[PDB]
Amino acid sequence: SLIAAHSHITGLGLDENLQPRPTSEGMVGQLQARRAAGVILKMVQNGTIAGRAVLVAGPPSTGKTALAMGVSQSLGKDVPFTAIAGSEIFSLELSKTEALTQAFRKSIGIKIKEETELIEGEVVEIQIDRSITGGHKQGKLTIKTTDMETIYELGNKMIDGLTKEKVLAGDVISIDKASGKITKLGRSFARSRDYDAMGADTRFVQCPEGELQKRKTVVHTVSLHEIDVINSRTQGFLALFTGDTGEIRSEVRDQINTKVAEWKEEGKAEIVPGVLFIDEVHMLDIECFSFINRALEDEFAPIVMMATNRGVSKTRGTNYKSPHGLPLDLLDRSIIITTKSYNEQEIKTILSIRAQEEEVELSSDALDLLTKTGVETSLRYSSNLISVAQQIAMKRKNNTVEVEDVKRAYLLFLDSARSVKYVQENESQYIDDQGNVQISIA
Amino acid sequence: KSLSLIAAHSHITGLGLDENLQPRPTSEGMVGQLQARRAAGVILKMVQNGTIAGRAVLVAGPPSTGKTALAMGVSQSLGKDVPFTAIAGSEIFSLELSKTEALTQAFRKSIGIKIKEETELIEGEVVEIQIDRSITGGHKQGKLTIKTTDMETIYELGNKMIDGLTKEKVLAGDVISIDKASGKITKLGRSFARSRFVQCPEGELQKRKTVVHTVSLHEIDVINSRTQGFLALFTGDTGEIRSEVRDQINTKVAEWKEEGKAEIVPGVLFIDEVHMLDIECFSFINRALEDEFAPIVMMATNRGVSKTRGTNYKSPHGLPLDLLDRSIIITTKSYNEQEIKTILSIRAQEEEVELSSDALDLLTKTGVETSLRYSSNLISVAQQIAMKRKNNTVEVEDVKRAYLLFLDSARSVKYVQENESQYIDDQGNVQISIAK
Amino acid sequence: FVKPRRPYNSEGMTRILRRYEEDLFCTF
Amino acid sequence: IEIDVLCDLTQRQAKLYQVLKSQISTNYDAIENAATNDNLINAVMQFRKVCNHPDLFERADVDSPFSFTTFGKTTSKFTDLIYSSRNPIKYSLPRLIYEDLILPNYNNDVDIANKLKNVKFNIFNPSTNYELCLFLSKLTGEPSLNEFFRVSTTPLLKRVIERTNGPKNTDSLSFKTITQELLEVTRNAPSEGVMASLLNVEKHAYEREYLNCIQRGYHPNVSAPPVTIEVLGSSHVTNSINNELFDPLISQALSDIPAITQYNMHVKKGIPVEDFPKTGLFPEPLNKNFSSNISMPSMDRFITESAKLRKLDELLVKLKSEGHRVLIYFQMTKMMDLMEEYLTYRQYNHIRLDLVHDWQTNPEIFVFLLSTNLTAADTVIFYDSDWNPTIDSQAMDRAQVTVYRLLVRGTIEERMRDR
Amino acid sequence: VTRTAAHTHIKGLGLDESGVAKRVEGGFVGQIEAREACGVIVDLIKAKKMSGRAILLAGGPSTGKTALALAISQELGPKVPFCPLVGSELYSVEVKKTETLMENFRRAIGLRIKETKEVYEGEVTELTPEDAENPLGGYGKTISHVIVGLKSAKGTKTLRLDPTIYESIQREKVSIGDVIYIEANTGAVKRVGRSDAYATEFDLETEEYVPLPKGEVHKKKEIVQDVTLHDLDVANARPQGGQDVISMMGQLLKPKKTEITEKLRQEVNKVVAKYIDQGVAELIPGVLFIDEVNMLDIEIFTYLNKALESNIAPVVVLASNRGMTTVRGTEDVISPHGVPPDLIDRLLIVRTLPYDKDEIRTIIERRATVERLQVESSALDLLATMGTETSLRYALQLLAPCGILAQTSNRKEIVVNDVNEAKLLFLDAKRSTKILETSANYL
Amino acid sequence: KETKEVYEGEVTELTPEDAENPLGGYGKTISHVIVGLKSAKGTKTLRLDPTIYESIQREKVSIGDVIYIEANTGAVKRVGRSDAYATEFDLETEEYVPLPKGEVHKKKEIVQDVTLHDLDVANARPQGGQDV
Ligand SMILES: Nc1ncnc2c1ncn2[C@@H]1O[C@H](COP(=O)(O)OP(=O)(O)O)[C@@H](O)[C@H]1O
Ligand SMILES: Nc1ncnc2c1ncn2[C@@H]1O[C@H](COP(=O)(O)OP(=O)(O)O)[C@@H](O)[C@H]1O
Ligand SMILES: Nc1ncnc2c1ncn2[C@@H]1O[C@H](COP(=O)(O)OP(=O)(O)O)[C@@H](O)[C@H]1O
């Protein structure tokens, strides 16, 4: 894909003793928060501990969401990671508690084992009997490998999958019985009688040998929220993509919980927990905080990581101020990971990593100027200046980025403090809080 | 009878009044409040006369003084087939209905139309059913031999009777009922054959039955609205019935009363906590009380000089003075020791709670110092404490244990105020730590 | 022994037969 | 020799144990030592019945919603079955309301006002508003000017069923959007094409997540028909209600004609296919499991409902290579559950308690019962915990000596074993 | 092995036969008077006689109110309907909050019904329709009847279905050789699947293969079903289950909460009372639990005042951490626990007290044993001092990082160094607030 | 970028050729469908699949119509009638398209520019569900 702000983070950069390296897997510095995140990651990977609230706190441009993305990269596959912001909860078709419930159940995965018969072979003959209106469809499929040849009875869905990706005789195809997947591997006959209708140029495939039916066990992970949406109504699979899952009843949730407990006790399925990450958690209402307080005490509750960058600020939905924008009963249920600011060396290493990721060649003095600018103004400002300095240097028809390219990009694009000073020096030129402005020059 | 556990007003079977509208000191589960009960009897006679339309009354007083008890007494003394619509003030703030539309539905649910009609019914015990099938099945013939305690007859059935008897399968020994015009067969049940069980019905088959239907004006509004089926009477998605349908219903009801085919039964719309409405609902009530097809509206509130919802000023009873100008106010007063003791004894007698005289005196002292509802709630938990010790009678120690285990309002306030650091205040501050 | 096949009823239904050499559409 | 082996408690077993402990109560510790030392005995026997099998307590029948219905039920050549379900809730409507407000009458005006509002004052009438119809036909491109009056005066579901429109005017302002073009090119398109696969991702997500074979998890608790309205002495109400609930166009649309019936109308009766009633518009379910709310009692579930029976079944899976003998002890009514356990899927040669000499001559038989010399037996397995050892030693007097006391944790059974 | 949560260690209230509370039993430590009051309330619920009884669990944070509600639910058993709820859950964007409160009120009242089902089950042998003589009349359908032959174990019979029952048959895609299950109560058909009398190795649709059903065709079977009043209300408000086109199209519409009228609830109550009077169903009243009852505004409290006076209302238990707080939706109404005095008069406040050092220590010990962790005595004492200094929940939630740090260093025990490192890595609310007050760029 | 290989033009004949020994119990069992297409300077006779023939019945394709077949999918598309085949001189509501230019067999590379929101909108809705 494209290069984003967290593309360089490929994990957490920790040893087997949960000790962070000074620079590993795109993460440099922040050792105590990285060790705490490794402890959280090991607690997730254990899977026996449910519904723990974790708060990540610190100033802006420090690495809270960088730490969350490092946890997500170190989480591994087939483990859910639902990364949402605090503004997605406020919806017009869902309640706040229902949206929070859907976000909670999107983070709990169910690993299901299924038994599948794979039937790969050359098609001898397809007989399809259809009704006059084409509604009812049945028939037979005589399929063959180099050892034995069988005849199968086809249903409606298998015939519908045979009509699309049109299978003729002499075609080597694969049949997945548990999923209804028709895969045309190719054509093995190459008959002399060729029709003028098709434009098919299927490759030659060797005749498959051995047994025709092969038994195998497949493993797939489906989230809880998919199961409630599917079981909620008839066309729930459409609602999994349209998002028209309006306020699923609690009876569906209770029956799905009992059914997945029965699936766990049968050995058919297993429950893996994941991480619900909530960026900008101060934006939630006090009703959302109360629902989070009572929903953390559930058996099917994931590990909740929250990130906020605010001090003693006003809690939304109330009239008082609280630390981190969160009430004290929520902070009672949470363990707080604190993230601290960087020095010159950590900012320099972050900028060098970001320039290496962006395929931007920097000189030593250009990197020193970018480090000094990042220390003075902001790390994000210099990390944004890297790309436009690279564009300026490529406009100058030289491969590397020099000091004057960084100075030209600094002169062209402003930071927060310079723009604040320019606005305050030219106050009448801008619309103030009272809606007064002087457009006229004279 | 229907579903009824023991509730807060289960002991009230009506208003304990004489023929001269004089309240007895203890009758029909109601004690005390002589002026309030006499005023409620006057309002009940206004409803029973049926010639006065759109009168608003306000039952006002302190909490736990019997405003809802008075409304329940009026509802119980009203009788059957008279519409009593009891709603709370927060029920009309809907998401799919406007507040004036919800108030219109609540107003028109309390006016009924009484229609009497005749139907020919055949209710009998089936002796036997014979049906001789054809060679192919184009025509079916049959004989139904039915009987009662007095009569016994045989009927030559048509095709539609045979189809309506094979569906809803009737065998020999079934007491059934047949409506001839609508073709509906209802299996009342198995007769007294030893081999549910219902006795064989009395004679004179094919009898005229007079059915008296009381249909509220809201139901006819939902029916006459052609975009609304009567399932919206059960689903509740009527969705802002248009005014012109209501005008056609009013003209049709007036012409039915003039023709003599139907009668009008006015009822009572009771609004508990009427202060929870806002000012626009009060204005709509102020105009809607002037309709000819408007019921008598009882309103209950306990607030005193409170801020009116939707405004920024304060008004008596939470109600603006144009609404109080259109209403006559019934004032309920507090109870003394004897009335509290009689209410507690009635509540204990209803819940089958046998308690001693000194236990009654202790509960009366608790209900005088604290509240009537606290002691009436303490009665049942004291009974549970009594049967935990395998005792069938509530003693003084059971009431003492119930008072120790469960707190009242003032004790909870005092215990909170003595330990206010352990709770969450208005600023969200709490000290969850117990040391240092 | 061997269990018999399920009875296959295709009366009054058009047939599409795809074989090695030719394809047939037996319609009505 | 003695190999007491332990098990857990399943979800239904734990639910039955909790409901028994809450519905019995009365000093459960005294119940525990009462079960240790040996009304009172029936609670101990029903607790042991719950511990043995959840289906020993009540049989698990079908999992269906509660039918909120009144129907024609038998109180007790072909017998016909006719749909006769009705709601127990009956709404009584008087004849006066129906005959004076809904039906046309000489003193009524509903037909006259309906024609005046729907036909005479319709703005899509070509007799009075031909200019608006011409403008809308230039806009939409409809080949018929009467389409707007027909569409505006038909029910929406009836319109949805009867939308078979083929030609459109090219000289019109109705434009073909880009997304509609992408819909049209992949209406009938094979897989692995880039335009075909870029717009068919829901089917790919269906196929790769194995959603074709996923079991149903939720069914409703109560299933109810609509509330039946009865009007006494009027067949018009019954005819209108039957025409509304069982409208043949909507009923035919949500179903299909049988194929031999389609052959009879098309070939034998000469009806063209274009004049057939529209069928097959009912949406397909996710699976065959999602087609109905009724769930059959699974035989494979019955093994895993009891941890004792599940562990015993995987023990016969493990020890199928060597003959043995099973012992049930004092618990009655657990025999027929075992007979239907081993005669449905896992067929083992067996006898029911002569047969001792049959065991001593035939070694291909596998399972004993003998609820309370047999030296030809080689491996014994019990089904009761450590009771008074007199009858236990009498049982092992029959008798390699391998002993299995299937013990269950978290229950009175393991309590008494520990005693 | 087993996944644990905040209230996994609690098995019940843990009382004697006389109602007194043992100090440490049932997963509970302390709160003797609160547990005794909850046991009295549990006995009141088990009496199944009263309606609308309401208590309030009042206390500080982390004092065990939700623990007591879960203990009440565990002591009542799975048959008694327990409806847990938050005060924030009543604010729905589909329907009004009072309707949601009434729906939860009906959801907390249960019913156990014996139901007789008439069943035609068996393997389809023949399935022949009889066509209508005028197929295109527009008044009937293309067929008149359908003859279907079903054989069970030791029994064979044929059925003549009307087109509605055959429509229900053919929507299940029933062919020759399918064991099926027709329910005569609703007309619903279950296709059990292919019979095993034929060959089962030549299908492609991963079907299941079932034997012939035992007994005769046309059985009458008794099923014990546990429903709620809300289930009946939502089934009658949105009708699904019939074979008429209204039920079938209402199956396919998007479900949405509606304001269920009082007329439908009274009709459902009449039918349920008729079921009770015939002795075929029994009523099981239950518990509606509302945690964080401070989140309700004044309209929900006003509707609660009316709804508690009903003759079918369940036992409602509430929890609140608030002290003298203003009621939500009001301006100047200062009330205890954020609950207005009109509802407080209808309540029975059950106080819950904070814990001591040793109670916190044994709570930490029980939470360590339920999470399968081994803690040294000195580390347990340091955890107890940390719990008394910061918070009980912070000491309980630090056990899992201590176990992670213990298993990192290849140890099973939790040493004092592990809990010191977990104290250093993870912060409580007070230390985080002290960092917030002494920081410049709004930490 | 994608490759479209199509045969389009005014049609000349539609002969659903019957097979030898054509089974039993069915009428007009089709071995193949011969379609004679013509365009500007080109004329091609195509031997199609039998299963295209019902699509011939689906789009109401008669002799004189301008049709359009993609090679990969084999789906016909009745664009309209030819301008020369305006036989109904008095009254007709057919759309008379001109005869298409170039050869009948044309294989062309086309480029389609969409957005990701267009893909999300087209994938969200049920693509040809054909239900109520
Ligand atoms: N330890 C780190 N290693 C690498 N990059 C980091 C680190 N900490 C912060 N960053 C970078 O700093 C930027 C701001 O961090 P981020 O977490 O996105 O915002 P905030 O810290 O304000 O929540 C990100 O683009 C991220 O790539
Ligand atoms: N006069 C009375 N006679 C009998 N019972 C009464 C009387 N007044 C009040 N009660 C009972 O006291 C309880 C609380 O009174 P309530 O009707 O709630 O008063 P209010 O509605 O003014 O708060 C009710 O259950 C009611 O039955
Ligand atoms: N008496 C007790 N014995 C054992 N554990 C308790 C006790 N009281 C509280 N806890 C534990 O303390 C935690 C907080 O209890 P909870 O009821 O959720 O908070 P609150 O009391 O604020 O509602 C719970 O996880 C519970 O397990």
Structure description:
Chain A is an alpha/beta fold and 442 residues long. Chain A has helices spanning 31-46, 64-74, 96-105, 156-163, 224-232, 236-242, 250-266, 286-295, 328-332, 344-357, 364-376, 379-395, 403-412, 416-425; strands at 23-24, 27-28, 53-57, 81-85, 109-130, 137-144, 149-154, 171-176, 181-187, 213-223, 269-272, 275-279, 303-308, 312-314, 321-323, 334-338. Chain A has 14 helices and 16 strands. In chain A, a hairpin with a 6-residue loop joins strand 14 and strand 15 (321-323). Chain A is globular. The N and C termini of chain C lie far apart (40 Å). Chain C contains no helices and two strands. Chain C is mainly β and 28 residues long. In chain C, 36% of the residues are buried. Chain C has a two-stranded antiparallel sheet with strand order 1-2. Chain D contains 21 helices and nine strands. In chain D, strands 1-9 form a two-stranded parallel sheet. At the D-E interface, helix 1, strand 2, strand 3, strand 5 and helix 14 of D face helix 2, strand 5, strand 6, strand 7 and helix 4 of E. The complex binds adenosine-5'-diphosphate (ADP) (3 copies). The site of one adenosine-5'-diphosphate has 15 residues of chain E, from strand 2 and helix 2. Chain D: GO terms for molecular function: ATP binding; ATP hydrolysis activity; ATP-dependent chromatin remodeler activity; DNA binding; histone binding.
